[PDB]
Paper text:
Cyclophilins are peptidyl-prolyl isomerases (PPIases: EC 5.2.1.8) and are characterized by their ability to catalyze the interconversion of cis and trans isomers of proline. In order to understand the molecular basis of these results, we sought structural coverage of the entire human cyclophilin enzymatic class. We determined crystal structures of seven human PPIase domains—PPIC, PPIE, PPIG, PPWD1, PPIL2, NKTR, and SDCCAG-10. All cyclophilins share a common fold architecture consisting of eight antiparallel β sheets and two α-helices that pack against the sheets. The active site of the cyclophilin family includes the invariant catalytic arginine (Arg55) and a highly conserved mixture of hydrophobic, aromatic, and polar residues including Phe60, Met61, Gln63, Ala101, Phe113, Trp121, Leu122, and His126.
In addition, binding of CsA or derivatives was seen for PPIF, PPIG, PPIH, and NKTR. In the case of PPIG and PPIH, this explains previous data describing cyclosporin binding to the tri-snRNP complex that contains PPIH and verifies the finding from a homolog that PPIG is capable of binding cyclosporin. Additionally, the NMR-based assay does not require substrates to contain chemical modifications, and can be used to measure effects of amino acid substitutions at regions distal to the target proline not measurable by other methods. We detected binding and turnover for at least one of the tetrapeptide substrates tested for PPIA, PPIB, PPIC, PPID, PPIE, PPIF, PPIG, PPIH, PPIL1, PPWD1, and NKTR. For instance, the residue that is at position 103 in PPIA varies from alanine in about half of the cyclophilin isoforms to a serine in PPIE, PPIH, and PPIL2; an arginine in PPIG and NKTR; lysine in PPIL6; asparagine in PPIL3 and PPIL4; and glutamine in RANBP2. The division between “deleted” β1-β2 loops and “full-length” β1-β2 loops follows a phylogram distribution of PPIase domains, with the more conserved isoforms relative to PPIA (PPIB, PPIC, PPID, PPIE, PPIF, PPIG, PPIH, PPIL6, NKTR, and RanBP2) encoding full-length loops and the more divergent members by sequence (PPIL1, PPIL2, PPIL3, PPIL4, SDCCAG-10, and PPWD1) encoding deleted β1-β2 loops. There are three distinct classes of conformations adopted by this loop: the PPIA α1-β3 loop family, which includes PPIA, PPIB, PPIC, PPIE, and PPIF; a shorter version of the loop represented by the structures of PPIL1, PPIL2, PPIL3, PPIL4, SDCCAG-10, and PPWD1; and a longer version found in PPID, PPIG, PPIH, PPIL6, and NKTR.
Author numbering: 7 to 179
Write the structure that this text describes.
Protein backbone atom coordinates (compact mmCIF):
# COMPACT_ATOMS: atom_id res chain seq x y z
CA UNK A 1 0.00 0.00 0.00
CA UNK A 2 1.32 3.50 -0.93
CA UNK A 3 2.05 6.15 1.73
CA UNK A 4 1.78 9.87 0.97
CA UNK A 5 2.35 13.03 2.95
CA UNK A 6 1.22 16.65 3.32
CA UNK A 7 3.28 19.25 5.24
CA UNK A 8 0.66 21.78 6.30
CA UNK A 9 1.09 25.50 7.01
CA UNK A 10 -1.59 27.75 8.52
CA UNK A 11 -1.09 31.38 7.56
CA UNK A 12 2.42 30.37 6.58
CA UNK A 13 3.31 28.81 9.94
CA UNK A 14 4.07 25.04 9.89
CA UNK A 15 1.29 23.04 11.66
CA UNK A 16 2.98 19.71 10.91
CA UNK A 17 2.74 16.64 8.65
CA UNK A 18 -0.25 14.50 7.72
CA UNK A 19 0.63 10.98 6.44
CA UNK A 20 -1.91 8.84 4.52
CA UNK A 21 -2.04 5.17 3.67
CA UNK A 22 -3.67 4.50 0.31
CA UNK A 23 -5.99 1.45 -0.13
CA UNK A 24 -4.48 0.59 -3.52
CA UNK A 25 -5.75 -3.00 -3.11
CA UNK A 26 -9.32 -1.56 -3.05
CA UNK A 27 -9.34 1.40 -5.50
CA UNK A 28 -6.08 1.32 -7.42
CA UNK A 29 -7.01 3.95 -10.06
CA UNK A 30 -8.19 6.42 -7.37
CA UNK A 31 -5.04 5.77 -5.33
CA UNK A 32 -2.73 6.25 -8.35
CA UNK A 33 -4.28 9.62 -9.08
CA UNK A 34 -3.81 10.87 -5.48
CA UNK A 35 -0.32 9.39 -5.33
CA UNK A 36 0.77 11.22 -8.50
CA UNK A 37 -0.86 14.50 -7.44
CA UNK A 38 1.31 14.33 -4.28
CA UNK A 39 4.50 13.73 -6.23
CA UNK A 40 3.50 15.92 -9.20
CA UNK A 41 5.06 13.26 -11.50
CA UNK A 42 2.39 13.34 -14.27
CA UNK A 43 3.14 17.00 -15.12
CA UNK A 44 0.53 19.35 -16.62
CA UNK A 45 -3.24 19.10 -16.27
CA UNK A 46 -4.85 18.51 -19.62
CA UNK A 47 -7.87 20.86 -19.38
CA UNK A 48 -6.46 23.04 -16.58
CA UNK A 49 -2.97 23.59 -18.07
CA UNK A 50 -1.61 23.66 -14.51
CA UNK A 51 0.60 21.24 -12.61
CA UNK A 52 -1.07 18.05 -11.49
CA UNK A 53 0.40 18.71 -8.01
CA UNK A 54 -0.96 19.43 -4.54
CA UNK A 55 2.12 21.53 -3.64
CA UNK A 56 0.83 25.03 -2.65
CA UNK A 57 -2.81 23.77 -2.78
CA UNK A 58 -5.36 24.94 -0.21
CA UNK A 59 -7.83 23.20 2.07
CA UNK A 60 -10.49 25.55 0.61
CA UNK A 61 -13.42 24.12 2.60
CA UNK A 62 -13.74 23.23 6.30
CA UNK A 63 -16.88 22.13 8.16
CA UNK A 64 -16.42 21.47 11.91
CA UNK A 65 -17.77 18.04 12.92
CA UNK A 66 -17.86 16.91 9.27
CA UNK A 67 -14.75 17.15 7.06
CA UNK A 68 -11.91 19.25 5.57
CA UNK A 69 -11.66 19.53 1.80
CA UNK A 70 -8.81 20.52 -0.53
CA UNK A 71 -7.06 19.54 -3.76
CA UNK A 72 -8.43 22.30 -6.07
CA UNK A 73 -5.05 23.13 -7.49
CA UNK A 74 -6.19 25.31 -10.38
CA UNK A 75 -8.81 27.58 -8.69
CA UNK A 76 -8.39 27.10 -4.91
CA UNK A 77 -12.12 27.30 -4.28
CA UNK A 78 -13.94 24.09 -5.36
CA UNK A 79 -14.46 25.08 -9.05
CA UNK A 80 -11.20 23.67 -10.43
CA UNK A 81 -9.04 20.61 -10.41
CA UNK A 82 -8.55 17.68 -12.72
CA UNK A 83 -7.44 14.03 -12.43
CA UNK A 84 -4.12 12.69 -13.79
CA UNK A 85 -6.06 10.93 -16.60
CA UNK A 86 -7.48 14.11 -18.26
CA UNK A 87 -10.75 15.40 -16.80
CA UNK A 88 -12.61 13.20 -14.34
CA UNK A 89 -12.79 9.47 -13.73
CA UNK A 90 -15.37 6.87 -12.69
CA UNK A 91 -16.36 6.00 -9.14
CA UNK A 92 -14.29 2.83 -8.66
CA UNK A 93 -15.41 1.37 -5.22
CA UNK A 94 -17.99 1.93 -2.49
CA UNK A 95 -16.46 -0.96 -0.42
CA UNK A 96 -14.85 1.21 2.31
CA UNK A 97 -17.46 2.85 4.53
CA UNK A 98 -17.44 6.47 5.79
CA UNK A 99 -17.64 5.17 9.35
CA UNK A 100 -14.86 7.09 11.17
CA UNK A 101 -12.88 10.33 11.27
CA UNK A 102 -9.63 10.52 9.36
CA UNK A 103 -10.83 8.67 6.26
CA UNK A 104 -9.60 10.02 2.88
CA UNK A 105 -12.29 10.25 0.23
CA UNK A 106 -12.97 11.84 -3.16
CA UNK A 107 -14.95 15.04 -3.32
CA UNK A 108 -16.98 15.27 -6.55
CA UNK A 109 -19.69 17.09 -8.53
CA UNK A 110 -22.02 14.02 -8.66
CA UNK A 111 -21.69 10.54 -10.26
CA UNK A 112 -18.34 9.75 -12.00
CA UNK A 113 -16.81 13.25 -11.59
CA UNK A 114 -13.58 12.28 -9.63
CA UNK A 115 -10.86 14.90 -10.27
CA UNK A 116 -8.07 16.08 -7.90
CA UNK A 117 -10.31 17.14 -5.03
CA UNK A 118 -10.40 15.17 -1.76
CA UNK A 119 -11.74 15.38 1.74
CA UNK A 120 -10.66 14.02 5.16
CA UNK A 121 -13.67 13.07 7.30
CA UNK A 122 -13.70 14.39 10.92
CA UNK A 123 -16.62 12.27 12.25
CA UNK A 124 -18.51 9.24 10.95
CA UNK A 125 -20.29 10.40 7.78
CA UNK A 126 -22.22 7.31 6.65
CA UNK A 127 -24.54 9.33 4.43
CA UNK A 128 -21.60 9.80 2.01
CA UNK A 129 -21.43 6.05 1.29
CA UNK A 130 -22.20 5.37 -2.44
CA UNK A 131 -21.65 9.02 -3.31
CA UNK A 132 -17.94 9.37 -2.56
CA UNK A 133 -15.14 6.86 -2.97
CA UNK A 134 -13.16 6.20 0.24
CA UNK A 135 -9.58 5.39 -0.92
CA UNK A 136 -7.32 6.00 2.12
CA UNK A 137 -6.79 6.91 5.76
CA UNK A 138 -4.70 9.21 7.94
CA UNK A 139 -1.92 7.23 9.75
CA UNK A 140 -0.26 10.20 11.48
CA UNK A 141 -1.01 13.92 11.88
CA UNK A 142 -4.52 13.49 13.26
CA UNK A 143 -3.93 16.57 15.50
CA UNK A 144 -3.04 18.63 12.40
CA UNK A 145 -6.39 17.58 10.79
CA UNK A 146 -8.19 18.77 14.01
CA UNK A 147 -6.28 22.04 13.81
CA UNK A 148 -7.56 22.53 10.21
CA UNK A 149 -11.10 21.49 11.20
CA UNK A 150 -11.08 24.22 13.86
CA UNK A 151 -10.24 27.10 11.46
CA UNK A 152 -12.69 30.01 11.47
CA UNK A 153 -14.29 30.14 8.03
CA UNK A 154 -16.01 32.67 5.75
CA UNK A 155 -19.50 32.48 4.20
CA UNK A 156 -18.41 29.73 1.78
CA UNK A 157 -16.68 27.68 4.62
CA UNK A 158 -13.26 28.76 3.32
CA UNK A 159 -10.79 29.36 6.14
CA UNK A 160 -9.89 32.99 6.89
CA UNK A 161 -6.37 31.69 7.53
CA UNK A 162 -4.60 30.18 4.53
CA UNK A 163 -4.40 26.34 5.11
CA UNK A 164 -1.80 25.34 2.53
CA UNK A 165 0.07 22.21 1.51
CA UNK A 166 3.68 23.62 1.60
CA UNK A 167 5.24 20.30 0.65
CA UNK A 168 3.90 16.88 -0.34
CA UNK A 169 4.97 13.56 -1.82
CA UNK A 170 5.25 9.84 -1.38
CA UNK A 171 7.03 8.06 1.43
CA UNK A 172 9.22 5.47 -0.38
CA UNK A 173 9.72 2.63 2.10
Amino acid sequence: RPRCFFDIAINNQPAGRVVFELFSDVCPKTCENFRCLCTGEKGTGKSTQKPLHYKSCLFHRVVKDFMVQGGDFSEGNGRGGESIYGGFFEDESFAVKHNAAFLLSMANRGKDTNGSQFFITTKPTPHLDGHHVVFGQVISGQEVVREIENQKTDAASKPFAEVRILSCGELIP
